[PDB]
């Protein structure tokens, strides 16, 4: 409807796939080459389904900060025959707060879904399903089961992936440029 949704749509149409693990279907953001991200609670194994195609996982790393605290991001390298458009220049370099964000989801359950979530707070620490977690972004939207892996954007920036909620608020793990240096 406006330039927020325009940037979100541009990322969804070229840089997302549907990932299926034994723990469900997730929006999965492709970042560059055959490298993508997914919430760590998806429990990626040796094989994953990508748009319903059986795909070998070449590498998977659950990220933690230098306090050895969970970040809830898993970086996955996929044995896929095609590269993603490189979107690393849209990733923030530092932790920050944001205005006027969009959460975008694409699964079998929620195709072509875009949610204007509004102001995003650098929340920091969250006990997420019992697991101490750092670098959490918070927005005041009642997000639901099925939105995990959803991409959080502002105009010009890809800032996080949705990892949970409490029924009133939603929470995303930060994406930082430093996670994807090669």
UniProtKB/Swiss-Prot annotation:
It catalyses: Selective cleavage of Gln-|-Gly bond in the poliovirus polyprotein. In other picornavirus reactions Glu may be substituted for Gln, and Ser or Thr for Gly. Residues 2-180 form the Peptidase C3 domain. It is found in: Host cytoplasm. The active site is at residues 41, 72, 148. Interacts with host IFIH1/MDA5; this interaction inhibits host IFIH1. Major viral protease that mediates proteolytic processing of the polyprotein. Cleaves host EIF5B, contributing to host translation shutoff. Also cleaves host PABPC1, contributing to host translation shutoff. Binds and inhibits host IFIH1/MDA5, thereby inhibiting the type-I IFN production and the establishment of the antiviral state. Cleaves host MAP3K7/TAK1, resulting in inhibition of TRAF6-triggered NF-kappa-B induction. Cleaves host TICAM1; this interaction allows the virus to disrupt host TLR3 signaling. Cleaves host IRF7, resulting in inhibition of type-I IFN production. This is Protease 3C. The chain holds residues 1549 to 1729 of 2188 of the full protein.
């Amino acid at each position: 409807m406006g330039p927020g949704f325009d940037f979100a749509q541009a990322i969804m149409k070229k840089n997302t796939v549907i990932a299926r693990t034994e723990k469900g279907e997730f929006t999965m953001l492709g970042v560059y080459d055959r490298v993508a991200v997914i919430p760590t609670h998806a429990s990626v194994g040796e094989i994953i389904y990508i748009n319903d195609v059986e795909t070998r996982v070449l590498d998977a790393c659950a990220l933690r900060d230098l306090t050895d605290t969970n970040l809830e991001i898993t970086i996955v390298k996929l044995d896929r025959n095609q590269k993603f458009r490189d979107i690393r220049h849209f990733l923030p370099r530092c932790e920050d707060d944001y205005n006027d964000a969009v959460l975008s989801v694409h699964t079998s359950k929620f195709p072509n879904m875009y949610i204007p979530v509004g102001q995003v707070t650098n929340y920091g620490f969250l006990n997420l399903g019992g697991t101490p977690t750092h670098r959490i972004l918070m927005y005041n939207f009642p997000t639901r089961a099925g939105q995990c892996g959803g991409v959080v954007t502002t105009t010009g920036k890809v800032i996080g992936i949705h990892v949970g909620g409490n029924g009133a608020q939603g929470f995303a793990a930060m994406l930082l440029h430093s996670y994807f240096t090669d």
